[PDB]
Write a protein that binds this DNA or RNA. Structure first.
Length: 635
DNA sequence: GTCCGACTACGCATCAGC
């Protein structure tokens, strides 16, 4: 009756009686908002899943059509990933609507949200319009994302204001958080899926209301109930891993149930699937710890792109995040038949796209790959060539290869696909087991301009069932002593948002150009320190805050830190590679005439108390490390 | 170990302001 006191975390929660809306009527957003409250209140994931499951049970019982917008609102998504909807709502756009919402000056509201690290609390602080609807709020979110062209921003601000005026109680918090891409419930895809699997198992969909089954975990023992829901979750997890498309799963789920879901949502070309992720290992001996026979291929520094081929001849290319990248590769849709044999009529390969120079015939760094255009590229104006390095086969002429080992998948992969020096090659896989030649193959990969070594089993736990587990990642910056260690000067600091609200979330580091007797910014640092170390910083680091920057510091086109600090702290910082920065001035001119050097994948290691600012890593050295890189020393 | 959310550089794509 009154969604203002809605409680989805109640003991012995009844889907119908404990709800806050009438069946067949739309789901109110306050019901969704009060649950997010009960989810951010706790920290146990099994508690958040049960609380969100209570929403979905009430939703599947009272308003089945509203199930999809509730899920997307929970995931903070707008639809399937291959659709490509993006809010296009900047931060400043949101606080512009926030100031337009209440009435504070944009200079005042912009300061509050920065010091708080969250706009939801800032926005929450006329006649009442009708209460907000969950599916209608999701519609306004989609309406915002589709707004494009000139003057589209001011039209987005109107829609956001139209929601913030209709917000009741805590609704203003989660509309603002969702629009900025920071719901921060502690609950995401894995827990949303577990909560949706739970709901359709306790409250089966498609029941004549009032539903004859509101709690199907009634006559079950708690032991056999946990395995019941765990077996139900696994059926949903794997189906979603083959078809990560809630616009396809929910209609089939809502009508045929969870048990019959895999019989209709099958992995087929044209629909992207979740790719197999890797896992970072410590050292070479850390790999020999599971020790089963495995293979070892290079880890190529490019972009993950899986290539689908429908039976009808159409070819599509999706990215690691299911985003449609077919318009990005006209040079691939053309060279499609150059890799397949006559017997190939349908396929899906897990490849990595790396930039390839035609003249030198060598692999280019990652920066060259990300310089290609997107949207709708014409194959005539393609100035950055790309070469596929296939390392898995998922589909082959109507058949799905999910339940097959890497040893067999690699069989048909090499059997039904022809090489092409410069356009199509297989990831160089050296099958072995001895740790002597294994570490040798790893340090070789760098000479062939690669990140490191891929390690995946061949038979034992070697399927492509991403839901069950299984791959090992091994490059150079992981082993202690093999990474480029820089002793850098902390010159800037940035106020943190969310988890790091209050203290600093980032820091601006600098090398010491001994030639100009000045500090040069090189990169930012926001990972690699413990929460006690962050509290160890920020506090001891606050006694050195200064209003104006020192004259001997130089940041060029880097973000102005929220706090300038007296250069004194010297930090040990590990990094993967070194990058040619179009933003940072460190060693500007020492390699490229205009661009400096930045750190790729930097991270904090430890503070150097014995080291002084003058006794830190110089920009002069920094240039030699960029020249000593094998990806750079191959031109 | 899982899951989540802090955070990194780089570069295309886009739009308010001019």
């Amino acid at each position: 009756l009154d969604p203002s006191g809605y409680n989805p975390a109640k003991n012995n929660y009844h889907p119908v009686e404990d709800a806050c809306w009438k069946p067949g009527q739309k789901v109110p957003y306050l019901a969704v908002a009060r649950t997010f409250e009960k989810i951010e209140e706790v920290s146990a994931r099994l508690r958040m899943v049960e609380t969100l499951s209570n929403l979905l049970r009430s939703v599947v019982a009272l308003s089945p059509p509203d199930l999809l917008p509730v899920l997307y609102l929970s995931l903070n998504h707008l639809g399937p990933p291959q659709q490509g909807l993006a809010l296009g709502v900047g931060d400043g756009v949101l606080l512009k609507a926030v100031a337009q919402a209440t009435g504070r000056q944009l200079e005042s509201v912009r300061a509050e949200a920065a010091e708080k690290g969250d706009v939801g609390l800032v926005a929450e602080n006329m006649l009442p319009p009708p209460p907000l609807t969950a599916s209608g709020v999701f519609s306004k979110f989609r309406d915002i994302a589709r707004l494009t062209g000139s003057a589209s921003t001011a039209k987005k601000i109107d829609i956001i204001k139209g929601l913030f005026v209709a917000c009741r109680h805590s609704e203003a918090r989660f509309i603002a958080r969702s629009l900025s891409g920071r719901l921060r419930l502690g609950l995401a895809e894995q827990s949303v899926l577990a909560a949706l699997s739970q709901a359709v198992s306790l409250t089966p969909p498609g029941q004549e209301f009032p539903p004859a089954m509101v709690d199907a975990g009634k006559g079950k023992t708690a032991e056999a109930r946990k395995t019941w829901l765990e077996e139900q979750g696994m059926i949903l997890k794997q189906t979603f891993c083959e078809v990560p498309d809630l616009d396809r799963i929910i209609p089939v789920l809502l009508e045929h149930g969870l048990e019959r879901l895999p019989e209709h949502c099958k992995l087929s070309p044209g629909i992207p699937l979740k790719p197999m992720l890797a896992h970072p290992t410590r050292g070479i001996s850390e790999v020999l710890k599971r020790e089963a026979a495995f293979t070892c291929e290079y880890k190529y520094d490019g972009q993950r792109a899986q290539i689908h081929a429908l039976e009808g001849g159409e070819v599509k290319i999706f990215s690691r995040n299911q985003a449609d990248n077919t318009g990005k590769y006209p040079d691939i849709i053309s060279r499609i038949p150059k890799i397949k044999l006559p017997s190939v009529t349908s396929f899906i390969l897990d490849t990595e796209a790396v930039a390839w120079d035609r003249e030198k015939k060598q692999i280019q760094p990652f920066q060259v790959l990300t310089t290609r255009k997107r949207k709708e590229v014409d194959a005539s104006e393609i100035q950055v060539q790309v070469c596929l390095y296939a390392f898995d086969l998922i589909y082959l002429n109507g058949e799905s290869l999910v339940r097959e080992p890497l040893s067999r998948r690699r069989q048909l992969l090499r059997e039904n696909f022809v090489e092409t020096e410069g356009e199509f090659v297989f990831a160089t896989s050296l099958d072995t087991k001895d740790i002597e030649q294994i570490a040798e193959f790893l340090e070789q990969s760098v000479k062939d301009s690669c990140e490191g070594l891929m390690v995946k089993t061949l038979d034992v736990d070697a399927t492509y069932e991403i839901a069950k587990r299984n791959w090992l990642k091994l490059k150079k910056d992981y082993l202690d002593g093999v990474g480029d260690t820089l002793d850098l000067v902390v010159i800037g600091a940035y106020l943190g948002r969310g988890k790091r609200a209050g203290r600093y979330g980032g820091f601006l580091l600098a090398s010491y150009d001994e030639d100009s007797e000045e500090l040069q910014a090189i990169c930012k640092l926001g990972t690699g320190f413990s929460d006690e170390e962050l509290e160890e910083h920020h506090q001891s680091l606050k006694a050195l805050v200064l209003p104006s920057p020192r004259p001997y510091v130089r940041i060029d086109g880097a973000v102005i830190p929220d706090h300038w600090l007296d250069p004194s702290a010297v930090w040990e910082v590990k990094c993967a590679d070194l990058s040619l920065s179009p933003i940072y001035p460190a060693a500007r001119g020492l390699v490229d005439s205009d661009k400096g050097i930045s750190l790729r994948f930097p991270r904090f290691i430890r503070v150097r108390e014995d080291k002084q600012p003058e006794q830190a890593t110089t920009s002069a050295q920094v240039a030699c490390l960029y020249r000593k890189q094998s990806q750079i020393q191959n031109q």
